[PDB]
Amino acid sequence: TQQPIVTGTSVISMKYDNGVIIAADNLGSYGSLLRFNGVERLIPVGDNTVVGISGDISDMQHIERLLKDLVTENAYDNPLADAEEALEPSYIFEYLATVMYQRRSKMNPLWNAIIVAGVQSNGDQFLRYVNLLGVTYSSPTLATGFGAHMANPLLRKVVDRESDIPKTTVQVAEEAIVNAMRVLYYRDARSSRNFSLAIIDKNTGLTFKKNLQVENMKWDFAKDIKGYGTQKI
Amino acid sequence: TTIVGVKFNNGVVIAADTRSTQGPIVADKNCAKLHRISPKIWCAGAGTAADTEAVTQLIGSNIELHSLYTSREPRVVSALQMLKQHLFKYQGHIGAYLIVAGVDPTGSHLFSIHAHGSTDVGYYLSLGSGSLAAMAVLESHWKQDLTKEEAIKLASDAIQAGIWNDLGSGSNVDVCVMEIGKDAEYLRNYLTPNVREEKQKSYKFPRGTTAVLKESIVNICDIQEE
Amino acid sequence: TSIMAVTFKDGVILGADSRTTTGAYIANRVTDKLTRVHDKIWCCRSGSAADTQAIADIVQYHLELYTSQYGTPSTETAASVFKELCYENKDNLTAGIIVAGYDDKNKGEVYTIPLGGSVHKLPYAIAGSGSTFIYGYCDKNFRENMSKEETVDFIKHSLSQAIKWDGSSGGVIRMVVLTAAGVERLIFYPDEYEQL
Amino acid sequence: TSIMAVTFKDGVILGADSRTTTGAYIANRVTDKLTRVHDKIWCCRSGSAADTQAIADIVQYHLELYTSQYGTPSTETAASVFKELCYENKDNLTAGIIVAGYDDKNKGEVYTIPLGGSVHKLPYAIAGSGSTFIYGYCDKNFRENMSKEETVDFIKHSLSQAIKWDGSSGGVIRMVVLTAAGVERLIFYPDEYEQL
Amino acid sequence: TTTLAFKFQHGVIAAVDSRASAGSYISALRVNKVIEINPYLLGTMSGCAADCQYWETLLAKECRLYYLRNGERISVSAASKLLSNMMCQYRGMGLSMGSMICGWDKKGPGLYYVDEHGTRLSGNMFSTGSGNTYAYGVLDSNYKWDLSVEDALYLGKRSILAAAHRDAYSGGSVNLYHVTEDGWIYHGNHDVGELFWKVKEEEGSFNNVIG
Amino acid sequence: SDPSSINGGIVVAMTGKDCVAIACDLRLGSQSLGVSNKFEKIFHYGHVFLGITGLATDVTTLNEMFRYKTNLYKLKEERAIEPETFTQLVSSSLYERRFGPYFVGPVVAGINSKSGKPFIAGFDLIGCIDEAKDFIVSGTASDQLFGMCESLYEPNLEPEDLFETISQALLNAADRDALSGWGAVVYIIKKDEVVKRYLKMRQD
Amino acid sequence: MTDRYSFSLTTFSPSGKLGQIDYALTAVKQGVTSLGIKATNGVVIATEKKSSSPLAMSETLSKVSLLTPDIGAVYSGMGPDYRVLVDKSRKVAHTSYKRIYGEYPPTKLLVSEVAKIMQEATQSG
Amino acid sequence: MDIILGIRVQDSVILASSKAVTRGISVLKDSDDKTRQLSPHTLMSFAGEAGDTVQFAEYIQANIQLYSIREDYELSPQAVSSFVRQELAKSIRSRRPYQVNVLIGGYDKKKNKPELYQIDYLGTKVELPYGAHGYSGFYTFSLLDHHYRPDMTTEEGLDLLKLCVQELEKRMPMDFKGVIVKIVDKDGIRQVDDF
Amino acid sequence: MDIILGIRVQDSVILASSKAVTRGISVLKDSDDKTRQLSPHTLMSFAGEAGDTVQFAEYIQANIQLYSIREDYELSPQAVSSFVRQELAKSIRSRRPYQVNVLIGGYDKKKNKPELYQIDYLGTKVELPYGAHGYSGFYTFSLLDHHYRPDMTTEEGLDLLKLCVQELEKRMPMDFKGVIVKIVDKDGIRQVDDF
Amino acid sequence: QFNPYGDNGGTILGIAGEDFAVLAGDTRNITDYSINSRYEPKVFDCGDNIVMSANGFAADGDALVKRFKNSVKWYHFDHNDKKLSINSAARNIQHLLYGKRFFPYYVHTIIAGLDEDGKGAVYSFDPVGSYEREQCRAGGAAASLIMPFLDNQVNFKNQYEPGTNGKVKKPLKYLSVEEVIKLVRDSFTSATERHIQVGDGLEILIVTKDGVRKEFYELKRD
Numbered sequence A: 001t002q003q004p005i006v007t008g009t010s011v012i013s014m015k016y017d018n019g020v021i022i023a024a025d026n027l028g029s030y031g032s033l034l035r036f037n038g039v040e041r042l043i044p045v046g047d048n049t050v051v052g053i054s055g056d057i058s059d060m061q062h063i064e065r066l067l068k069d070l071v072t073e074n075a076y077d078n079p080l081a082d083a084e085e086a087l088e089p090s091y092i093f094e095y096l097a098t099v100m101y102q103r104r105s106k107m108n109p110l111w112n113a114i115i116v117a118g119v120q121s122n123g124d125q126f127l128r129y130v131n132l133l134g135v136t137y138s139s140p141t142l143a144t145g146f147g148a149h150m151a152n153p154l155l156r157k158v159v160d161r162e163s164d165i166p167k168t169t170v171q172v173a174e175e176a177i178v179n180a181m182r183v184l185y186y187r188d189a190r191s192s193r194n195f196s197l198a199i200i201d202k203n204t205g206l207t208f209k210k211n212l213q214v215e216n217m218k219w220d221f222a223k224d225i226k227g228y229g230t231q232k233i
Numbered sequence B: 001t002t003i004v005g006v007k008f009n010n011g012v013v014i015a016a017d018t019r020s021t022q023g024p025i026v027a028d029k030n031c032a033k034l035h036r037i038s039p040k041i042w043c044a045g046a047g048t049a050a051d052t053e054a055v056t057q058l059i060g061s062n063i064e065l066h067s068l069y070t071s072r073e074p075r076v077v078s079a080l081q082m083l084k085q086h087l088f089k090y091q092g093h094i095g096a097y098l099i100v101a102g103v104d105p106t107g108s109h110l111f112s113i114h115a116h117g118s119t120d121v122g123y124y125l126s127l128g129s130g131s132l133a134a135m136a137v138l139e140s141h142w143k144q145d146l147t148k149e150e151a152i153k154l155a156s157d158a159i160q161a162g163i164w165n166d167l168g169s170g171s172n173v174d175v176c177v178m179e180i181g182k183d184a185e186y187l188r189n190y191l192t193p194n195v196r197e198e199k200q201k202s203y204k205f206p207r208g209t210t211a212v213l214k215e216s217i218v219n220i221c222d223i224q225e226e
Numbered sequence C, D: 001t002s003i004m005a006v007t008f009k010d011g012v013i014l015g016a017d018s019r020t021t022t023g024a025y026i027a028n029r030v031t032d033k034l035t036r037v038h039d040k041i042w043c044c045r046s047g048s049a050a051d052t053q054a055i056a057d058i059v060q061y062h063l064e065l066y067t068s069q070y071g072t073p074s075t076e077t078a079a080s081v082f083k084e085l086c087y088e089n090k091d092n093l094t095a096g097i098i099v100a101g102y103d104d105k106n107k108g109e110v111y112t113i114p115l116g117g118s119v120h121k122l123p124y125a126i127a128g129s130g131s132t133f134i135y136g137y138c139d140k141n142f143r144e145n146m147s148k149e150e151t152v153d154f155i156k157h158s159l160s161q162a163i164k165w166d167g168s169s170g171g172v173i174r175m176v177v178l179t180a181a182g183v184e185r186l187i188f189y190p191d192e193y194e195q196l
Numbered sequence E: 001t002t003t004l005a006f007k008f009q010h011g012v013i014a015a016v017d018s019r020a021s022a023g024s025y026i027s028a029l030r031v032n033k034v035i036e037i038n039p040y041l042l043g044t045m046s047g048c049a050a051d052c053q054y055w056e057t058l059l060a061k062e063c064r065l066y067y068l069r070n071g072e073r074i075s076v077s078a079a080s081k082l083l084s085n086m087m088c089q090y091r092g093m094g095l096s097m098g099s100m101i102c103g104w105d106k107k108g109p110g111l112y113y114v115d116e117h118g119t120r121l122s123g124n125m126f127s128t129g130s131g132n133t134y135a136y137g138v139l140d141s142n143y144k145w146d147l148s149v150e151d152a153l154y155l156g157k158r159s160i161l162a163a164a165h166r167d168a169y170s171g172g173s174v175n176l177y178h179v180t181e182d183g184w185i186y187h188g189n190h191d192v193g194e195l196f197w198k199v200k201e202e203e204g205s206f207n208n209v210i211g
Numbered sequence F: 001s002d003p004s005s006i007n008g009g010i011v012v013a014m015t016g017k018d019c020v021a022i023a024c025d026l027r028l029g030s031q032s033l034g035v036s037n038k039f040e041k042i043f044h045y046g047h048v049f050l051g052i053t054g055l056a057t058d059v060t061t062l063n064e065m066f067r068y069k070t071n072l073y074k075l076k077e078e079r080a081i082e083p084e085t086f087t088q089l090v091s092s093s094l095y096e097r098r099f100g101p102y103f104v105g106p107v108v109a110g111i112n113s114k115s116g117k118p119f120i121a122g123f124d125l126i127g128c129i130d131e132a133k134d135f136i137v138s139g140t141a142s143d144q145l146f147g148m149c150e151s152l153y154e155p156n157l158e159p160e161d162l163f164e165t166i167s168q169a170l171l172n173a174a175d176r177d178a179l180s181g182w183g184a185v186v187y188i189i190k191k192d193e194v195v196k197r198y199l200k201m202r203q204d
Numbered sequence G: 001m002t003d004r005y006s007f008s009l010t011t012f013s014p015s016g017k018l019g020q021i022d023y024a025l026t027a028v029k030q031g032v033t034s035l036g037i038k039a040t041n042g043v044v045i046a047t048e049k050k051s052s053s054p055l056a057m058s059e060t061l062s063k064v065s066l067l068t069p070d071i072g073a074v075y076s077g078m079g080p081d082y083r084v085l086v087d088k089s090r091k092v093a094h095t096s097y098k099r100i101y102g103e104y105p106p107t108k109l110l111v112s113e114v115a116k117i118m119q120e121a122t123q124s125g
Numbered sequence H, I: 001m002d003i004i005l006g007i008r009v010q011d012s013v014i015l016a017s018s019k020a021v022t023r024g025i026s027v028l029k030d031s032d033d034k035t036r037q038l039s040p041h042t043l044m045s046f047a048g049e050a051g052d053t054v055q056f057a058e059y060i061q062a063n064i065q066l067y068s069i070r071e072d073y074e075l076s077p078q079a080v081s082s083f084v085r086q087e088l089a090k091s092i093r094s095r096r097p098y099q100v101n102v103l104i105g106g107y108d109k110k111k112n113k114p115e116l117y118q119i120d121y122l123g124t125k126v127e128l129p130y131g132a133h134g135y136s137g138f139y140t141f142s143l144l145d146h147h148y149r150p151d152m153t154t155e156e157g158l159d160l161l162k163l164c165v166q167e168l169e170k171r172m173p174m175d176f177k178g179v180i181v182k183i184v185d186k187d188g189i190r191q192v193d194d195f
Numbered sequence J: 001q002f003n004p005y006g007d008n009g010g011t012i013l014g015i016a017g018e019d020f021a022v023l024a025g026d027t028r029n030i031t032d033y034s035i036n037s038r039y040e041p042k043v044f045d046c047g048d049n050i051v052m053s054a055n056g057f058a059a060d061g062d063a064l065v066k067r068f069k070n071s072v073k074w075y076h077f078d079h080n081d082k083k084l085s086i087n088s089a090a091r092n093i094q095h096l097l098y099g100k101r102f103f104p105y106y107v108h109t110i111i112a113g114l115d116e117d118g119k120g121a122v123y124s125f126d127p128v129g130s131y132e133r134e135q136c137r138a139g140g141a142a143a144s145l146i147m148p149f150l151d152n153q154v155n156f157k158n159q160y161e162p163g164t165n166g167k168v169k170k171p172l173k174y175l176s177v178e179e180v181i182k183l184v185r186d187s188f189t190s191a192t193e194r195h196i197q198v199g200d201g202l203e204i205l206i207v208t209k210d211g212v213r214k215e216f217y218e219l220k221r222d
């Protein structure tokens, strides 16, 4: 049993016709102190998988090292390490899920919420969630923390069920994700303007976008708001 | 509960879902959460349902007497001031969280109130367990100089987000539109996107299925003449 | 919350962020924390929003009644009324208020009233959760008898840093200028102050 | 405690106050919080004095054994050893450590290891109870590739403010300069830094 | 829950209710609170159902292994003791168990009460569960050693009914067993709803209840 | 410990075609101990019927309170109170004890004597009104009753068909509740005749 | 200070008359005429707006007053006494009825409440 | 002051109440009468917290005696029980409630019927053919449910009561030092001096 | 399993132990024998937490019987009591102590003397002319302090024991369902079947 | 303090027919007032004509199902590909559950299939492994809403034959698979109306001698 110290907020994601998109901001909070601003919370594994992590950052860095070690280990005595016997998103998730549940079962959890996004060998989209309790679930849209409450409602308007996935393009999906990140920046007190976004497509592969910013913000209406009821000036 | 308020060109609109719950159980599937403080001042309530009803009726009663005393139509700032001072005095023990909206001779107004007595001003607001789902929609689609039609659309879309995504909210959308120089129009069950499908079977029993010990006529009439 | 008031040559300026939070949720991102209790006596509020609104409303009432009987109240008098409410009800209040006002005789004055209900007259004051991160910056950069433009820059830069580090602070930077010339409201948006 | 490490053109400089407290009593007013784990790899300690001394001693042992086998360790390697101890024993430790070192290949580097045992490589780092009051000042005044004299002034001014506001910080300002030229110790007394 | 067991001339009667509750919610109307350890041994069940099921099912393992080794059937005393010693292993750990081990061996009919504390009591009559006080009243006032098998079966049945009526957490149905030297004999499942009205009319009892 | 489940019991009400039904069990207990099988939970003031579940002392107190108030109402108004008006009176009376409430779940049932419209309503312990068109449930087996009513109910049932529906809703709900049962009563209410029926059920 | 008049100012005279009530009725007699007529589908109440001065805006003085949405009142006698009775009548319609039963009082019962207030000013100290 | 039983037979009500009073680990008294005569044909037994029991009982007694003198009339058992219930319902929401459970055994001279009312400290009233408080019912009700008839004589009621006490004496862990038994009928209240 | 008394007279040791066993609010048994024979001339009675009492007693019994067979010799009462004390002193600092109080009544055949040892669950041993555990001593010791002589016969010891039980039955709140009495002398251990 | 347990909601229902069995469950997964997934399968085909669902805390549920599926695989390895009978599976699950008696799988488990005589079978487990063969069993959030309805409509409780007035019970006639599915759908539709954690979808697994078949139905998404 512990408590999280340095923490990362929401990770958000969704499926689209040819793949998956995942995003997360670049902040490492120390309680209410916005302590670290250059924290990368999306960690690619090969060219087919991106693991997005929220919660305790020290545990995130530990998981990051496990995934790095996993790639090294898979390449050992493996002539097809960059082909048929490369790591799949499903392999990476199942491993993490095993670790997460084992750690909670020893009453010493990795204090995180994780989303594994990727594309399988056969072209199938992969998107699944796991957290500190070992709880797992899949959905056309997935989000952690605040994102679950604010991003999912917006992303579900685009892909409401399985049959909406083939009708959703990468442009529409990315647009929805970017808008959700803006909404989280308006409303989550532990968020930042700077974020990373990753697209894993079955045709164009892994596109990793760094140093993105929330833009097109509405603040002008604030000038007219005065007092808390009766004040006119 | 999901409740919202949205300002527009010539007035203000409020909206709410219709699900009331006790724990995980749905007590009423078509609850009325849009309460009338005065003809053109309406409010929607989240939190303890009895408190939102009671505090609205009390201030509404005193607002009516105030209107008669002053020979003036009631103002939203008066309802706001009376609500907040009542709620502050009870130090959050009256669990009323309200969005108050209306039109009066001063213009159109939109406020929120918390149970401890703090108030806020805004062009768009949301309260309740589904407020985060609703606010996500409002933050995505709100703009300055909305028309009446656009505001009703935005408000009901925000409630829908709560209905579908928040387990504490559900069933129908109620709306009330308050426009300057017009009667307030209360639109009960403005949307009905959750009608139950027909059941597979009829469960009407044959007569005489239940075992009975005794029968008797109950005298509901008063003592009779002669 | 990040709030401050700064005296300068022509009077005083109040400054504030616009973020109110319930835990980590931003319940209002465009809050007005600069509240008017009299024509040229304003205050910055921090702590319980319910408490500081209730206090400010009572003070506004007291100063309105004072004015009807005895004419325009001094800033010291306004601070005294705030203090009386905060001190006597210290067990049941969570309020940190900065009082700022302009007289013609006294010019710009600033009084801070922390949690206990004590009063402290100062050349400038900072308060709220975000103030902790700018004690160093403000102490190094404050000068007495600054110009209006200098004081606006000082408050803009100060609250910018408070917002940058404090998660409970954010949104727009609101300001109210109190001088002989009158009352001026200023607003500064994120795209402006974040690049400072 | 107020501690910081700042990279500059010729390398890195570590800075610290000298106050250790037991509650409100100053148990030591001339503490040395700048601790050597290798020739040109030093650290600033904050948190439990017992824990950070125990950790630093173990690290010094590890780097001494590393050196005997593999030659001079990198600053990154030293930070990794600190992290391993802090992360794996997070339940039983209260330690906030900044690691600073000079390589010829990598030049000046700074790593901060907060309570949880995470690692963060930074151009400069601040930590300890007094650091809260200088987040604004340090963010506004830090530049990359400063001179030795500029970096000394930056740390002196920064820790001066931290000491001024934080009761748990005080005494003398100690500094250690890490460059190609060698290791230089500096000390600055209250009469010097209080008048800044 | 209400369970009882008593010794008499031609063996031992075992009677139990069949209700299970989760707070006020009745989760089961028909749980089996007698375990057929083997053809010559029965065990009642009160407390934690899982603890009773697991440890007495395991007791049967031990009793079977005993017979294979020694070439002779295990006594009721020995069987009850093996069970009580398993409990003492997990003493203070939270096990919840209260049951009557019923059987017929060389010393005749035998009946032992065993609980989670390790307690092991030999006796002529026992009752456990939330409705045991009601069953004891009927048992104590009508019990003789000189009872016939027919009357003894009815006594145990009537005693559970008394508990099922008054105790909110007892009811559903009554399960009867009669333990002989040739083994236990099952005497059926009896719905309490139907049994109550039947007993009320025939016996004249429960006058206060309108039927 | 929980005042709303010490004594146990249930009430259910339903609307039909030109009629209403209200029903209750007869149990009163002290937690596990069954104390009385004749504790009726439905009362009437004129043609308005009130069922009350919860803490038995408050059930009795509130009945006496509403008899008191409806008798004064009648003397002053010179007419019997209507279901709609009585519902507001129950709500008002419960809310006046906001911070020291009666631990009850009241249920109103009746037909307006002037309009002929069937009416039912339910309340939480502090006065919040639930005015359902279909059915109202209350007591320690309210979850069970919701399940029964939601599947068994259909609108515009004739009085004798409504009797079967509400009876089966009560009985089967009570048989899945330890603290309910020990008999049951059903009222079938029409504009100018009311029939009361005691049901035969298992007594455990 | 304190109200030290805790005794009745209206008392029975030897002849059984309550003087102050009779004198109050005399004041009513001097007042401007007002009337009421009941029809099958309505009721009408009327009075004269006796303006004290032509410079006075007699529209601002309301002799006919709404008590509830379905109940109205008019008077003859002392105008200020009427005005405060209208204030009390409007309030009592809420406090002793609407806040209890969720509806406005019937005419006869609101009348009864106003009557009670007037009776008490005839006996109280 | 724990065990109190009641049974209503054909023509009388019988109340049985334990004799023990315990202070700490010592039994102070083994002859305590846990009862008060409220009126000539109405008897109330009681059990609950120390002190409150007698204080409440005597307070009720004083009020019924006051009513009797004022009206020159004996209140019916039903009327007395309702008065007592209201006082307890009143008391449960007081600053410090009276922790007292009672049985009221009365003979109604108007209806010529015995009546037994059971009221707990919350003000929970029920009219019963037989009743008890606390755990007393747990041991005795199965016997009463079996043997009780409404046409029982006083002598048969006493015999059934003896069986109930014997079962209590067998299966209760506490020694309650026997019971005092009193009969309420048309002729008034009398004590059975050998039980 | 709460009352155990012992008395050492001229030529024997007498142990008296209650017969009741209670589970919850119900007395399960009224004939329980709270004693184990450790050797032909040594008897141990016990009282404490449920389960632990019998388990500890039987464990001690097994060990003394093992010693008896190994050496073909009966340990003196003093030696047995010391063994028992050490086991309890050992147990009190264990993970889960055995909550058991004992009386050891033995006749030493070498010295031709009866001996009574009182040992509580902490391992507190004392040799006494008469002893008890729990609250038993609070009621009985004033009688024993008054009437006891060291030259009492077995019959006089039984009479003094009857007086002690009578005082327990009068002033003690719980019902312990009488006592089983056993005598330990030169001829061994026997039970008094009428008491 | 770290709480190793959680509540993922969900409601399951097992009914045994004469020569068939059904195990049904809703597809909604939740924490608190949020929906994690509208379609997260909860009832699983474990091989050997056995279907299983472990409802409650989903992490423990997935772990138990995974371990039981594993136990079926090793039963084949160790005992010459012998078919694991439903009674043998039930006893095996008890030991899996009781193995964690002092740190339980926080789930209510139900399995369904056919017994060795080809008759429909359902077994029901508590979190620590007490079990029993049953005809009808609802589990999870809305279990209390569903079971009383099943008592009435499957077992005909409190239903008597018209004209006799309580003297003759309604006879317990056997139900077809089509009849059972109707009662399952109406159970979940009614539960969806009154329980906030029930909705989105209903997945039913039907077991006969021919094998395992699946049926899916939409439920209200509010």
Ligand SMILES: [Mg+2]
Pocket (backbone or CB within 6 Å): D048, D050, D051, D092, D093
């Ligand atoms: Mg330490």
Ligand SMILES: [Mg+2]
Pocket (backbone or CB within 6 Å): D162, D163, D164, D165, D166, D167, D168, D169, D170
């Ligand atoms: Mg200092």
Ligand SMILES: [Mg+2]
Pocket (backbone or CB within 6 Å): E081, E082, E083, E085, E086
């Ligand atoms: Mg064993």
Ligand SMILES: [Mg+2]
Pocket (backbone or CB within 6 Å): E163, E164, E165, E166, E167, E168, E169, E170, E171, F203, F204
């Ligand atoms: Mg029962």
Ligand SMILES: [Mg+2]
Pocket (backbone or CB within 6 Å): I118, I119, I120, I124, I125, I126
């Ligand atoms: Mg001792």
Ligand SMILES: [Mg+2]
Pocket (backbone or CB within 6 Å): B162, B163, B164, B165, B166, B167, B168, B169, B170, J221, J222
């Ligand atoms: Mg919803």
